[PDB]
PDB file of all heavy atoms in Angstrom:
ATOM      1  N   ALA A   1       0.810  -1.212  -0.015  1.00 51.63           N
ATOM      2  CA  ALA A   1      -0.002  -0.007  -0.027  1.00 51.63           C
ATOM      3  C   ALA A   1       0.865   1.268  -0.008  1.00 51.63           C
ATOM      4  O   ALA A   1       1.952   1.268   0.564  1.00 51.63           O
ATOM      5  CB  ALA A   1      -0.988  -0.005   1.185  1.00 51.63           C
ATOM      6  N   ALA A   2       0.350   2.314  -0.608  1.00 49.58           N
ATOM      7  CA  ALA A   2       0.980   3.667  -0.519  1.00 49.58           C
ATOM      8  C   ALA A   2      -0.052   4.776  -0.725  1.00 49.58           C
ATOM      9  O   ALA A   2      -1.250   4.499  -1.156  1.00 49.58           O
ATOM     10  CB  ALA A   2       2.164   3.787  -1.465  1.00 49.58           C
ATOM     11  N   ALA A   3       0.313   6.038  -0.532  1.00 51.02           N
ATOM     12  CA  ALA A   3      -0.663   7.161  -0.409  1.00 51.02           C
ATOM     13  C   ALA A   3      -1.360   7.681  -1.615  1.00 51.02           C
ATOM     14  O   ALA A   3      -2.355   8.441  -1.462  1.00 51.02           O
ATOM     15  CB  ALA A   3       0.040   8.288   0.421  1.00 51.02           C
ATOM     16  N   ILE A   4      -0.931   7.339  -2.827  1.00 53.70           N
ATOM     17  CA  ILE A   4      -1.605   7.694  -4.077  1.00 53.70           C
ATOM     18  C   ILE A   4      -1.493   6.635  -5.179  1.00 53.70           C
ATOM     19  O   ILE A   4      -0.590   5.798  -5.105  1.00 53.70           O
ATOM     20  CB  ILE A   4      -1.087   9.018  -4.689  1.00 53.70           C
ATOM     21  CG1 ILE A   4       0.411   8.930  -4.995  1.00 53.70           C
ATOM     22  CG2 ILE A   4      -1.374  10.281  -3.818  1.00 53.70           C
ATOM     23  CD1 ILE A   4       0.804   9.532  -6.326  1.00 53.70           C
ATOM     24  N   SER A   5      -2.302   6.711  -6.195  1.00 50.41           N
ATOM     25  CA  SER A   5      -2.108   5.970  -7.443  1.00 50.41           C
ATOM     26  C   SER A   5      -1.192   6.753  -8.383  1.00 50.41           C
ATOM     27  O   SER A   5      -1.428   7.888  -8.790  1.00 50.41           O
ATOM     28  CB  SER A   5      -3.477   5.683  -8.131  1.00 50.41           C
ATOM     29  OG  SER A   5      -4.162   4.769  -7.363  1.00 50.41           O
ATOM     30  N   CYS A   6      -0.050   6.148  -8.646  1.00 47.20           N
ATOM     31  CA  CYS A   6       1.067   6.815  -9.420  1.00 47.20           C
ATOM     32  C   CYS A   6       0.604   7.063 -10.876  1.00 47.20           C
ATOM     33  O   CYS A   6       0.855   8.160 -11.401  1.00 47.20           O
ATOM     34  CB  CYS A   6       2.293   5.912  -9.317  1.00 47.20           C
ATOM     35  SG  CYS A   6       3.857   6.538 -10.007  1.00 47.20           S
ATOM     36  N   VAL A   7      -0.180   6.156 -11.444  1.00 46.54           N
ATOM     37  CA  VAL A   7      -0.658   6.116 -12.845  1.00 46.54           C
ATOM     38  C   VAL A   7      -1.523   7.302 -13.298  1.00 46.54           C
ATOM     39  O   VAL A   7      -1.799   7.449 -14.485  1.00 46.54           O
ATOM     40  CB  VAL A   7      -1.472   4.870 -13.108  1.00 46.54           C
ATOM     41  CG1 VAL A   7      -0.604   3.596 -13.014  1.00 46.54           C
ATOM     42  CG2 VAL A   7      -2.595   4.655 -12.097  1.00 46.54           C
ATOM     43  N   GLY A   8      -2.110   8.116 -12.376  1.00 47.96           N
ATOM     44  CA  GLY A   8      -3.145   9.118 -12.669  1.00 47.96           C
ATOM     45  C   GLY A   8      -2.885  10.022 -13.859  1.00 47.96           C
ATOM     46  O   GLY A   8      -3.497   9.852 -14.868  1.00 47.96           O
ATOM     47  N   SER A   9      -2.058  11.002 -13.641  1.00 47.15           N
ATOM     48  CA  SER A   9      -1.671  11.976 -14.674  1.00 47.15           C
ATOM     49  C   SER A   9      -0.236  12.457 -14.452  1.00 47.15           C
ATOM     50  O   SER A   9       0.633  12.210 -15.316  1.00 47.15           O
ATOM     51  CB  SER A   9      -2.658  13.136 -14.776  1.00 47.15           C
ATOM     52  OG  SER A   9      -3.668  12.830 -15.672  1.00 47.15           O
ATOM     53  N   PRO A  10       0.111  13.100 -13.347  1.00 43.68           N
ATOM     54  CA  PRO A  10       1.492  13.336 -12.878  1.00 43.68           C
ATOM     55  C   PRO A  10       2.032  12.044 -12.209  1.00 43.68           C
ATOM     56  O   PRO A  10       1.253  11.161 -11.925  1.00 43.68           O
ATOM     57  CB  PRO A  10       1.393  14.470 -11.906  1.00 43.68           C
ATOM     58  CG  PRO A  10       0.101  14.176 -11.206  1.00 43.68           C
ATOM     59  CD  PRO A  10      -0.830  13.656 -12.300  1.00 43.68           C
ATOM     60  N   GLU A  11       3.335  11.948 -11.978  1.00 39.76           N
ATOM     61  CA  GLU A  11       3.910  10.880 -11.182  1.00 39.76           C
ATOM     62  C   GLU A  11       3.387  10.818  -9.748  1.00 39.76           C
ATOM     63  O   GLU A  11       2.576  10.000  -9.358  1.00 39.76           O
ATOM     64  CB  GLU A  11       5.463  10.845 -11.267  1.00 39.76           C
ATOM     65  CG  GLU A  11       5.987  10.550 -12.676  1.00 39.76           C
ATOM     66  CD  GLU A  11       7.484  10.792 -12.784  1.00 39.76           C
ATOM     67  OE1 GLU A  11       7.864  11.956 -12.934  1.00 39.76           O
ATOM     68  OE2 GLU A  11       8.308   9.853 -12.694  1.00 39.76           O
ATOM     69  N   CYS A  12       3.794  11.836  -8.870  1.00 40.58           N
ATOM     70  CA  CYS A  12       3.514  11.705  -7.461  1.00 40.58           C
ATOM     71  C   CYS A  12       3.319  12.986  -6.643  1.00 40.58           C
ATOM     72  O   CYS A  12       2.193  13.283  -6.244  1.00 40.58           O
ATOM     73  CB  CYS A  12       4.452  10.710  -6.798  1.00 40.58           C
ATOM     74  SG  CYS A  12       4.309  10.454  -5.061  1.00 40.58           S
ATOM     75  N   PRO A  13       4.410  13.806  -6.389  1.00 41.44           N
ATOM     76  CA  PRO A  13       4.344  14.899  -5.427  1.00 41.44           C
ATOM     77  C   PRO A  13       3.160  15.904  -5.613  1.00 41.44           C
ATOM     78  O   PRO A  13       2.517  16.276  -4.618  1.00 41.44           O
ATOM     79  CB  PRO A  13       5.678  15.551  -5.378  1.00 41.44           C
ATOM     80  CG  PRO A  13       6.402  14.983  -6.636  1.00 41.44           C
ATOM     81  CD  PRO A  13       5.762  13.701  -6.937  1.00 41.44           C
ATOM     82  N   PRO A  14       2.808  16.349  -6.843  1.00 40.78           N
ATOM     83  CA  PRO A  14       1.643  17.281  -7.052  1.00 40.78           C
ATOM     84  C   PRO A  14       0.239  16.625  -6.931  1.00 40.78           C
ATOM     85  O   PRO A  14      -0.755  17.318  -7.017  1.00 40.78           O
ATOM     86  CB  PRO A  14       1.888  17.880  -8.440  1.00 40.78           C
ATOM     87  CG  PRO A  14       2.489  16.684  -9.208  1.00 40.78           C
ATOM     88  CD  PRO A  14       3.390  16.043  -8.147  1.00 40.78           C
ATOM     89  N   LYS A  15       0.192  15.281  -6.668  1.00 41.67           N
ATOM     90  CA  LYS A  15      -1.040  14.515  -6.444  1.00 41.67           C
ATOM     91  C   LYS A  15      -1.314  14.255  -4.978  1.00 41.67           C
ATOM     92  O   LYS A  15      -2.436  13.983  -4.576  1.00 41.67           O
ATOM     93  CB  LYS A  15      -0.957  13.254  -7.329  1.00 41.67           C
ATOM     94  CG  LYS A  15      -2.284  12.524  -7.554  1.00 41.67           C
ATOM     95  CD  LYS A  15      -2.131  11.162  -8.299  1.00 41.67           C
ATOM     96  CE  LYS A  15      -1.452  11.237  -9.615  1.00 41.67           C
ATOM     97  NZ  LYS A  15      -0.233  10.370  -9.660  1.00 41.67           N
ATOM     98  N   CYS A  16      -0.253  14.213  -4.102  1.00 38.00           N
ATOM     99  CA  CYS A  16      -0.356  14.035  -2.626  1.00 38.00           C
ATOM    100  C   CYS A  16      -1.112  15.183  -1.945  1.00 38.00           C
ATOM    101  O   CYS A  16      -1.756  14.934  -0.905  1.00 38.00           O
ATOM    102  CB  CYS A  16       1.040  13.863  -2.049  1.00 38.00           C
ATOM    103  SG  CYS A  16       1.869  12.307  -2.544  1.00 38.00           S
ATOM    104  N   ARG A  17      -1.016  16.390  -2.495  1.00 40.40           N
ATOM    105  CA  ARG A  17      -1.686  17.578  -2.108  1.00 40.40           C
ATOM    106  C   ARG A  17      -1.664  18.651  -3.270  1.00 40.40           C
ATOM    107  O   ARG A  17      -0.818  18.564  -4.149  1.00 40.40           O
ATOM    108  CB  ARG A  17      -1.086  18.267  -0.828  1.00 40.40           C
ATOM    109  CG  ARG A  17       0.397  18.616  -0.975  1.00 40.40           C
ATOM    110  CD  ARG A  17       0.943  19.447   0.190  1.00 40.40           C
ATOM    111  NE  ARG A  17       0.907  18.612   1.408  1.00 40.40           N
ATOM    112  CZ  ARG A  17       1.074  19.004   2.666  1.00 40.40           C
ATOM    113  NH1 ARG A  17       1.430  20.221   2.968  1.00 40.40           N
ATOM    114  NH2 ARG A  17       0.815  18.154   3.641  1.00 40.40           N
ATOM    115  N   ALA A  18      -2.521  19.715  -3.175  1.00 38.16           N
ATOM    116  CA  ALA A  18      -2.751  20.687  -4.215  1.00 38.16           C
ATOM    117  C   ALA A  18      -1.495  21.519  -4.609  1.00 38.16           C
ATOM    118  O   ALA A  18      -1.161  21.596  -5.798  1.00 38.16           O
ATOM    119  CB  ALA A  18      -3.866  21.549  -3.773  1.00 38.16           C
ATOM    120  N   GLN A  19      -0.798  22.059  -3.618  1.00 37.46           N
ATOM    121  CA  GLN A  19       0.481  22.791  -3.807  1.00 37.46           C
ATOM    122  C   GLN A  19       1.701  21.859  -3.989  1.00 37.46           C
ATOM    123  O   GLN A  19       2.782  22.326  -4.128  1.00 37.46           O
ATOM    124  CB  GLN A  19       0.676  23.838  -2.674  1.00 37.46           C
ATOM    125  CG  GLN A  19       0.746  23.213  -1.268  1.00 37.46           C
ATOM    126  CD  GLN A  19      -0.596  22.966  -0.614  1.00 37.46           C
ATOM    127  OE1 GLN A  19      -1.201  21.956  -0.759  1.00 37.46           O
ATOM    128  NE2 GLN A  19      -1.129  23.992   0.033  1.00 37.46           N
ATOM    129  N   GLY A  20       1.470  20.559  -3.928  1.00 37.14           N
ATOM    130  CA  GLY A  20       2.491  19.497  -4.070  1.00 37.14           C
ATOM    131  C   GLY A  20       3.352  19.304  -2.844  1.00 37.14           C
ATOM    132  O   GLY A  20       3.742  20.201  -2.111  1.00 37.14           O
ATOM    133  N   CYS A  21       3.730  17.994  -2.608  1.00 36.80           N
ATOM    134  CA  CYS A  21       4.726  17.583  -1.645  1.00 36.80           C
ATOM    135  C   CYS A  21       6.172  17.915  -2.131  1.00 36.80           C
ATOM    136  O   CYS A  21       6.423  18.117  -3.297  1.00 36.80           O
ATOM    137  CB  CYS A  21       4.540  16.156  -1.220  1.00 36.80           C
ATOM    138  SG  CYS A  21       3.241  15.862  -0.004  1.00 36.80           S
ATOM    139  N   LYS A  22       7.102  17.910  -1.170  1.00 39.77           N
ATOM    140  CA  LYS A  22       8.524  18.290  -1.407  1.00 39.77           C
ATOM    141  C   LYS A  22       9.185  17.282  -2.309  1.00 39.77           C
ATOM    142  O   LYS A  22       9.843  17.675  -3.292  1.00 39.77           O
ATOM    143  CB  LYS A  22       9.200  18.355  -0.015  1.00 39.77           C
ATOM    144  CG  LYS A  22       8.873  19.602   0.804  1.00 39.77           C
ATOM    145  CD  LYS A  22       7.399  19.756   1.213  1.00 39.77           C
ATOM    146  CE  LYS A  22       7.219  20.841   2.312  1.00 39.77           C
ATOM    147  NZ  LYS A  22       7.342  20.324   3.689  1.00 39.77           N
ATOM    148  N   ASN A  23       9.012  15.961  -2.064  1.00 42.96           N
ATOM    149  CA  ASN A  23       9.458  14.861  -2.976  1.00 42.96           C
ATOM    150  C   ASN A  23       8.486  13.626  -2.801  1.00 42.96           C
ATOM    151  O   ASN A  23       7.588  13.700  -1.972  1.00 42.96           O
ATOM    152  CB  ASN A  23      10.961  14.554  -2.653  1.00 42.96           C
ATOM    153  CG  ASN A  23      11.615  13.682  -3.728  1.00 42.96           C
ATOM    154  OD1 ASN A  23      11.061  13.405  -4.781  1.00 42.96           O
ATOM    155  ND2 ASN A  23      12.785  13.237  -3.423  1.00 42.96           N
ATOM    156  N   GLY A  24       8.754  12.585  -3.552  1.00 39.15           N
ATOM    157  CA  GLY A  24       8.085  11.247  -3.420  1.00 39.15           C
ATOM    158  C   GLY A  24       8.846  10.179  -4.125  1.00 39.15           C
ATOM    159  O   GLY A  24       9.826  10.380  -4.861  1.00 39.15           O
ATOM    160  N   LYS A  25       8.457   8.910  -3.974  1.00 41.10           N
ATOM    161  CA  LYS A  25       9.027   7.715  -4.572  1.00 41.10           C
ATOM    162  C   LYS A  25       7.934   6.725  -4.942  1.00 41.10           C
ATOM    163  O   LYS A  25       7.231   6.181  -4.101  1.00 41.10           O
ATOM    164  CB  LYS A  25      10.032   7.011  -3.663  1.00 41.10           C
ATOM    165  CG  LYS A  25      10.777   5.796  -4.140  1.00 41.10           C
ATOM    166  CD  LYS A  25      11.647   6.062  -5.425  1.00 41.10           C
ATOM    167  CE  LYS A  25      12.677   4.913  -5.453  1.00 41.10           C
ATOM    168  NZ  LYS A  25      13.292   4.784  -6.799  1.00 41.10           N
ATOM    169  N   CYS A  26       7.845   6.402  -6.262  1.00 44.53           N
ATOM    170  CA  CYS A  26       6.886   5.486  -6.888  1.00 44.53           C
ATOM    171  C   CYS A  26       7.634   4.169  -7.321  1.00 44.53           C
ATOM    172  O   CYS A  26       8.559   4.317  -8.084  1.00 44.53           O
ATOM    173  CB  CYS A  26       6.182   6.235  -8.007  1.00 44.53           C
ATOM    174  SG  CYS A  26       5.243   5.241  -9.210  1.00 44.53           S
ATOM    175  N   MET A  27       7.111   3.061  -6.899  1.00 42.56           N
ATOM    176  CA  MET A  27       7.734   1.760  -7.195  1.00 42.56           C
ATOM    177  C   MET A  27       6.919   0.951  -8.195  1.00 42.56           C
ATOM    178  O   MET A  27       7.431   0.738  -9.305  1.00 42.56           O
ATOM    179  CB  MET A  27       7.968   0.881  -5.875  1.00 42.56           C
ATOM    180  CG  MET A  27       8.840   1.624  -4.837  1.00 42.56           C
ATOM    181  SD  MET A  27      10.552   1.838  -5.332  1.00 42.56           S
ATOM    182  CE  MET A  27      11.224   0.185  -5.011  1.00 42.56           C
ATOM    183  N   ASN A  28       5.668   0.632  -7.879  1.00 39.54           N
ATOM    184  CA  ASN A  28       4.805  -0.060  -8.763  1.00 39.54           C
ATOM    185  C   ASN A  28       3.312   0.397  -8.538  1.00 39.54           C
ATOM    186  O   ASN A  28       2.751   0.102  -7.453  1.00 39.54           O
ATOM    187  CB  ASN A  28       4.933  -1.551  -8.644  1.00 39.54           C
ATOM    188  CG  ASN A  28       4.148  -2.374  -9.713  1.00 39.54           C
ATOM    189  OD1 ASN A  28       3.516  -1.803 -10.563  1.00 39.54           O
ATOM    190  ND2 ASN A  28       4.190  -3.670  -9.595  1.00 39.54           N
ATOM    191  N   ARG A  29       2.728   1.115  -9.522  1.00 38.43           N
ATOM    192  CA  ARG A  29       1.405   1.848  -9.469  1.00 38.43           C
ATOM    193  C   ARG A  29       1.145   2.775  -8.287  1.00 38.43           C
ATOM    194  O   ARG A  29       0.141   3.464  -8.314  1.00 38.43           O
ATOM    195  CB  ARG A  29       0.239   0.920  -9.595  1.00 38.43           C
ATOM    196  CG  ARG A  29       0.327  -0.266 -10.492  1.00 38.43           C
ATOM    197  CD  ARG A  29       0.684   0.050 -11.934  1.00 38.43           C
ATOM    198  NE  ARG A  29       0.257  -1.120 -12.818  1.00 38.43           N
ATOM    199  CZ  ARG A  29       0.979  -2.073 -13.272  1.00 38.43           C
ATOM    200  NH1 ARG A  29       2.238  -2.264 -12.957  1.00 38.43           N
ATOM    201  NH2 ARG A  29       0.456  -2.960 -14.028  1.00 38.43           N
ATOM    202  N   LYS A  30       2.011   2.858  -7.311  1.00 37.96           N
ATOM    203  CA  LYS A  30       1.750   3.529  -6.000  1.00 37.96           C
ATOM    204  C   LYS A  30       2.910   4.398  -5.606  1.00 37.96           C
ATOM    205  O   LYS A  30       3.993   4.303  -6.199  1.00 37.96           O
ATOM    206  CB  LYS A  30       1.440   2.412  -4.995  1.00 37.96           C
ATOM    207  CG  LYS A  30       0.113   1.651  -5.236  1.00 37.96           C
ATOM    208  CD  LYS A  30      -1.091   2.557  -5.182  1.00 37.96           C
ATOM    209  CE  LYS A  30      -2.376   1.834  -5.535  1.00 37.96           C
ATOM    210  NZ  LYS A  30      -3.557   2.640  -5.472  1.00 37.96           N
ATOM    211  N   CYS A  31       2.742   5.336  -4.629  1.00 35.34           N
ATOM    212  CA  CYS A  31       3.815   6.262  -4.200  1.00 35.34           C
ATOM    213  C   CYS A  31       3.783   6.624  -2.736  1.00 35.34           C
ATOM    214  O   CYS A  31       2.687   6.784  -2.205  1.00 35.34           O
ATOM    215  CB  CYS A  31       3.796   7.506  -5.074  1.00 35.34           C
ATOM    216  SG  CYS A  31       5.125   8.632  -4.740  1.00 35.34           S
ATOM    217  N   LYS A  32       4.941   6.788  -2.109  1.00 34.85           N
ATOM    218  CA  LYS A  32       5.144   7.369  -0.807  1.00 34.85           C
ATOM    219  C   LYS A  32       5.593   8.783  -0.938  1.00 34.85           C
ATOM    220  O   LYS A  32       6.592   9.046  -1.732  1.00 34.85           O
ATOM    221  CB  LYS A  32       6.094   6.450   0.001  1.00 34.85           C
ATOM    222  CG  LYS A  32       6.353   6.912   1.404  1.00 34.85           C
ATOM    223  CD  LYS A  32       7.139   5.934   2.332  1.00 34.85           C
ATOM    224  CE  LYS A  32       6.430   4.580   2.450  1.00 34.85           C
ATOM    225  NZ  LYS A  32       6.957   3.837   3.587  1.00 34.85           N
ATOM    226  N   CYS A  33       5.062   9.742  -0.257  1.00 31.89           N
ATOM    227  CA  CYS A  33       5.393  11.170  -0.310  1.00 31.89           C
ATOM    228  C   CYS A  33       6.359  11.602   0.890  1.00 31.89           C
ATOM    229  O   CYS A  33       6.107  11.223   2.046  1.00 31.89           O
ATOM    230  CB  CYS A  33       4.154  12.023  -0.438  1.00 31.89           C
ATOM    231  SG  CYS A  33       3.864  12.628  -2.149  1.00 31.89           S
ATOM    232  N   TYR A  34       7.418  12.400   0.594  1.00 29.72           N
ATOM    233  CA  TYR A  34       8.510  12.668   1.482  1.00 29.72           C
ATOM    234  C   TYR A  34       8.631  14.143   1.894  1.00 29.72           C
ATOM    235  O   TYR A  34       8.249  15.021   1.068  1.00 29.72           O
ATOM    236  CB  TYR A  34       9.860  12.190   0.814  1.00 29.72           C
ATOM    237  CG  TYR A  34       9.998  10.732   0.531  1.00 29.72           C
ATOM    238  CD1 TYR A  34      10.783  10.408  -0.626  1.00 29.72           C
ATOM    239  CD2 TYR A  34       9.422   9.772   1.317  1.00 29.72           C
ATOM    240  CE1 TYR A  34      11.046   9.003  -0.837  1.00 29.72           C
ATOM    241  CE2 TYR A  34       9.629   8.408   1.030  1.00 29.72           C
ATOM    242  CZ  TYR A  34      10.434   8.040  -0.092  1.00 29.72           C
ATOM    243  OH  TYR A  34      10.634   6.705  -0.308  1.00 29.72           O
ATOM    244  N   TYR A  35       9.220  14.365   3.014  1.00 29.02           N
ATOM    245  CA  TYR A  35       9.468  15.689   3.706  1.00 29.02           C
ATOM    246  C   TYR A  35       8.211  16.536   3.706  1.00 29.02           C
ATOM    247  O   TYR A  35       8.307  17.740   3.633  1.00 29.02           O
ATOM    248  CB  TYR A  35      10.685  16.378   3.008  1.00 29.02           C
ATOM    249  CG  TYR A  35      11.890  15.488   2.737  1.00 29.02           C
ATOM    250  CD1 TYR A  35      12.216  15.108   1.458  1.00 29.02           C
ATOM    251  CD2 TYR A  35      12.748  15.154   3.841  1.00 29.02           C
ATOM    252  CE1 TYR A  35      13.326  14.236   1.208  1.00 29.02           C
ATOM    253  CE2 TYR A  35      13.836  14.308   3.603  1.00 29.02           C
ATOM    254  CZ  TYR A  35      14.133  13.867   2.338  1.00 29.02           C
ATOM    255  OH  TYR A  35      15.257  13.041   2.152  1.00 29.02           O
ATOM    256  N   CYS A  36       7.045  15.892   3.871  1.00 28.51           N
ATOM    257  CA  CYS A  36       5.714  16.549   3.686  1.00 28.51           C
ATOM    258  C   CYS A  36       4.693  16.086   4.649  1.00 28.51           C
ATOM    259  O   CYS A  36       4.329  16.929   5.549  1.00 28.51           O
ATOM    260  CB  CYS A  36       5.291  16.228   2.221  1.00 28.51           C
ATOM    261  SG  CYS A  36       3.819  17.003   1.614  1.00 28.51           S
TER     262      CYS A  36
END
């Protein structure tokens, strides 16, 4: 499990919140958001 679906439209950080997270890491269809 992780906090978003990576496949949506962007990769990850601008999908975790509206103004975007600081960074993230996507492995397989999913992503963890960092420093956020």
Side-chain angles (χ1 to χ4, degrees):
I4 59 137
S5 291
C6 188
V7 293
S9 271
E11 293 168 279
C12 178
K15 199 188 301 123
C16 292
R17 61 173 61 193
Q19 63 274 91
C21 278
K22 286 60 169 272
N23 194 8
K25 181 65 159 162
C26 165
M27 302 293 282
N28 188 0
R29 322 302 202 265
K30 296 297 180 179
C31 185
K32 183 173 297 198
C33 261
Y34 300 149
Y35 314 107
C36 187

